[PDB]
Ligand binder design. Structure first.
Ligand SMILES: *[C@@H]1O[C@H](CO)[C@@H](O)[C@H](O)[C@H]1NC(C)=O
Ligand SMILES: *[C@@H]1O[C@H](CO)[C@@H](O)[C@H](O)[C@H]1NC(C)=O
Ligand SMILES: *[C@@H]1O[C@H](CO)[C@@H](O)[C@H](O)[C@H]1NC(C)=O
Ligand SMILES: *[C@@H]1O[C@H](CO)[C@@H](O)[C@H](O)[C@H]1NC(C)=O
Lengths: 326, 326, 326, 326, 326
């Protein structure tokens, strides 16, 4: 019954609310180390990013102190979080309604007072997404941790001394690159001062699904539109061909609107290209109608030749411009 | 060993339900200050607005009275909400099934009794939206707080003394402007009266998603329907081209219905425009079928000339009318 | 103080399970008064109706009593439900997995056992919806409450003394009419007798999106189908016109099915009209194929004239028949 | 008070974990009676069935032994579930993460010791659906209950002595037919054995939406495909009309895939019919293209006449075979 | 009354945090065995696998020890886990926000200390999808359990003495094949040592939904696109028929993208085949336009004959190449 007597002696008058400090004026240097292990989802409909990971907490505890020489060693003791003081550091921009936790019900404590508590959670946060380069984009995400209840006058949110956590987690659909965290002084008001720890996650859209399913049909229908003027106006299918392109392009517009989120910043390049081929269809149908109703000598040959050349040059320049980004 | 002494000597017989007032007949002038920090979503499908923010409360505690002179200063103390009396003020029209909380497990207390409890939560509320101006609308939202358990005979929901809280919080899809809150005399019944705190949120749609997705294709194919009747009846393509507009406009109606909500006030201007180009296609198909039936001397020239002119003038007037909004 | 000693004296041995009655054989006249404040949704996919509101609970408490006269009055005391006996009155047809409560952790009680506990909740209930008149329907909804643990031999479940609760809270998408509640003698089994309190809500469909998204396109597409007999079969576009209507009607049925739910009673009028216009496309394509086969003497004039007349007259009679509902 | 004396003297040493048995080797006779009152939904996408119901139990309590003669009657006592022993009966195929209950916080108890502990809940069970006979299907599926925690050495899991459970819960969208429950002696291994209670539900799919949304469009387009071959190849509309059927049938396939679940056993007959008419379109387009190719004397009259005859007879025979189930 | 005596004697000083070991340095050999009873679903959109199953634990307890000979046998005693020390075994890749359990609040223990805790849960794990063979794939995926709180210095996560768990749980939509679990030494860092238990599952997609939904329409439209170039360019329907293919393929791509998940690694063969028939329709529209505008002697017969030969041979070779694997 050794651990039992340790629990009895060290839970003598231990309240779970008192600040674990020796001097009331002094603060406690609380360390933090966030580490994401995998990305689950990135839903741009609400700019929500859900990735699982673990947070590493350190703080020396004044009352937690004992000698292992006469206590048969056993320097590491596992104590549930409910019976021990718990830091209040949370995510500023959590997306979940309640800040839930996973297997965060047990923490290890050392004889000196060092506590290697390692909570794990599936963090859901918000980050700003640059949809202009979509899908060939490099949208950064930011994960920021800090305390809202107490201020710097209580605790000192610092970084780990050892920062050898420069890993690269590449997935089958998204590439995650870690960024060295920094400490910034958040300001809550003029009188009171706060603190925060920011870390960066490079998101690389390595999933071929988006570009392969979207841009390929758009460029194909652009190819079809490029060939419209070769059809003679008398074929009675020129208008039908163009209106078929109209229906197809509306179909791609609808699917893109279903997929590409309502919460939008700058216009996406794929949406701009689709709208550009859409006005392409508008203009070339207009010219086809002009040719056919002018027919009823037919000099439409020069007209649609210079027409075709103009669309050749403009389509090739827009295609190279959009390809230069990738 | 001092803070523990304060907790031992100040929580002697402190219940979690007794009103913290000295005179039983007297009420407490409880303060309130809400502040939204970021907008998450505005789903008009149920008129739900989800924004994260923080609420600020103040009330002097008669029981929690002591002097910092003889207790070695330390006027700032952190006590969990579970061990202290808690105001019951909540939000009237919350959308969540349970009125959840985030990091609302610790509050600060002073020597006088000044308690700056700062809960944070992602509030989901309801407010009426003016869809007549959709998507170029500036639909107000209302965030309102009050007490459902007790009435003015118990507390006094007042505002923060500092009212210069005019901040400019803009997002990537909406821009948010704060309005200074006001206190109103709510009436639960004839005998008893309650208080309410109401604040206004200017939501201005800065997202470019709606316009590019809906209006541009619709307006350009409205232009196409404007220019369609130049096709001769004998070309055997007027019916096909018009029915292609029929299919395309039905697809646009489908996507708008999937997006534009069921809960509707006045008809949206975009929906009205789409229905009007739909009846446009109906009418010009009518006229084209009548003309082709009559053809099978050349009396259709005047008919479709006046047709084209009349639809030019009505299309230009409707376009300027809808553009006058923005 | 005064409140503290009163709570100490009145919560000596008050269990949260003993029936608050003086005579064991006697029952307690528990009164209920439900009041809806706003409607959230009517999801006909599972015939679920979600509306927020508050319930007014009344019962006596012989065990809990005092004399305020010698105790400086103060007859109004707020006590959380966790420390007081609580009726088990629940909704019969709740949709949530757990019958949750909102800000119902405090109840006001007076001196002579007339506690005024007012729980609030967003009730999600089940009620039959009459889709035969959709969208011009008046689907009644029913909210029924009672006790399932104990029977009339324990409690009463009566109504409030005054019934002046005839409020007209109509929304921007639904019109809500309250109906005065009634008490009915529910039976739990043959041996035991129970009670139920039922209130009715008249739901008037005032949403305009439904009709402007469904009836207008179907009615004008039926109109367009009425135009096709004028086109000569030899024009090679009559078949194209008919197949275009076929595709349009298929799309129309598709998003109608996507919107109009699976759980259904009598067939909706819009579905009947859609099936009708499908029957028209079938019949008139049949006759067009017959005419074109005959052409490739010219007696189709009388045939399609009588076809056109019969179709127009029966279409107009069914349209006025369905218009008679609204 | 008297009931307070009962509670004090009957929970003197009552733990909420000890088996309520007198003899250690003896087991306790627990009964079961499950009754469904209203089905919520049947989502075949995950083979989940949400039905609202209640569960009735019987077990004598050795501790709850006393006589009402000396205690002034009072043979009906209300005891909350938290302070009393409860069986661990659980549905084997629940879908909710937690075995949630509704108003399961109170039970009755008598001097004999019988308990009408009757929780109500919305059970989301897993049961197999035979989609081959859609919509003319009679798919039985079952709810099975048991004790996964403890084994037969503790309890008995029997049925009610009175099995007068011949009640039919009729609905406007689904008909529920109850089957008498059964008991099986589950065998894990030589050392451990279990038990299970079975209730069977006949699901009559009385919803009329499914037929009007799926069979009607498919059969009408089958009629059009059957009657198309009269269109002469020289009309230049046969190919367009057939490809219009292609588009329509693809749209039907897409809507069926959206509705008819991914989790599938045998192919649905409606899906088979749609695929068969779609390959019908493919085959007769093949023949039409071959005929128009060989056109440039008209030998196609006999060819497409025998085509029409063969395909009409096969279509009518497959339709009557499909309908012969009823 | 002996069971209560046993509980009183064996729960004297049993805390829920003390490691249940005799020697503090010594660890406890904890054995584990996971077993899936039924798979719910495999959603590749988020790479989530929902499988109903149960976990089997083994560990001795130094404190829990008694002689059944002097206590009238009764070596099997059910105690809830809320009062007994419990290992913190957790899935590494759980998808649920909370690692919830189903009816796992009771465990029977033996006199020797051998514990039969039998938790059941709906495990939501992460699975990697090798969608190269989609849908005819054999995507194995794994479930791994470990101790994230404490390390090997506390307990030893081992396996059972026997591993005769070679069961074949076939479903109507998916075939589940268990794989013998293994033990791998997870490393939290260089200094500390952790452990992990891994199990694998062969997932055979026995569902016939995907093939009938996607491959049959794709293959037959590819066949008819193969056979279409027999249409003469002057028939005025070749362009119309090709654009009909364009529209149909666009709808099919839309529905496939809506169904086939966004989270993708390598391209599925079905999506590749659809894109390749898109390339096919683009190419033959190119050549059809070339033929029609070169018609305005007619040597296009050789051109489209060799065209037809080239596409037939490439299509047959690619189809047999993709079919040979299955
Ligand atoms: C504590 O906060 C101080 C603020 O001056 C900061 O510089 C540092 O990161 C923290 N730790 C120390 C004492 O170095
Ligand atoms: C409550 O606050 C109000 C400010 O609106 C002010 O009249 C006074 O301080 C208090 N009086 C009451 C009890 O209304
Ligand atoms: C409830 O009390 C009322 C008092 O009017 C009485 O009529 C009845 O006995 C009680 N229960 C019923 C059946 O309403
Ligand atoms: C209890 O189960 C036993 C078998 O263990 C069997 O006789 C019967 O089904 C049940 N009835 C009783 C009380 O014997």
């Amino acid at each position: 019954a050794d651990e039992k007597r340790l629990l009895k002696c060290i839970l003598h008058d231990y309240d779970t609310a008192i600040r674990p400090v020796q001097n009331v004026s002094d603060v406690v240097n609380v360390a933090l180390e966030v580490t994401v292990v995998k990305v689950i989802d990135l839903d741009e409909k609400e700019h929500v990013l859900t990735t699982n990971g673990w947070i590493y907490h350190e703080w020396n505890d004044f009352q937690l102190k004992w000698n292992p020489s006469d206590y048969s060693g056993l320097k590491k003791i596992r104590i549930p979080v409910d019976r021990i003081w718990t830091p209040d550091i949370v995510l500023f921009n959590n997306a979940d309604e309640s800040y839930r936790y996973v297997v965060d019900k047990l923490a290890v404590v050392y004889y000196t007072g060092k506590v290697m508590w390692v909570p794990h959670a599936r963090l859901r946060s918000f980050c700003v997404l640059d949809l202009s380069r979509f899908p060939f984009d490099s949208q950064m995400c930011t994960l920021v941790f800090g305390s809202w209840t107490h201020d710097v006058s209580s605790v000192n949110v610092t970084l780990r001394n050892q920062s050898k956590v420069q890993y690269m987690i590449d997935g089958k659909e998204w590439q995650v690159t870690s960024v060295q965290p920094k400490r910034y002084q958040w300001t809550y008001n003029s009188n009171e001062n706060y603190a925060g720890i920011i870390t960066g996650i490079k998101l690389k859209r390595t999933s071929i699904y988006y570009q392969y399913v979207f841009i390929m049909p758009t460029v194909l229908l652009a190819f079809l539109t490029l060939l419209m003027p070769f059809i003679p106006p008398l074929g009675k299918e020129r208008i039908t061909y163009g209106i078929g392109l109209v229906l197809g392009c509306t179909l791609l517009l609808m699917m893109l609107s279903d997929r590409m989120p309502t919460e939008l910043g700058n216009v996406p390049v794929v949406a701009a290209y689709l709208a550009y081929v859409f006005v392409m269809v508008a203009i070339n149908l207009l010219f086809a109608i002009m040719a056919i109703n002018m027919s009823m000598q037919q000099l439409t040959r020069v007209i649609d030749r210079l027409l075709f050349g103009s669309f050749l040059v403009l389509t090739v320049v827009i295609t190279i411009s959009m390809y230069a980004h990738y």
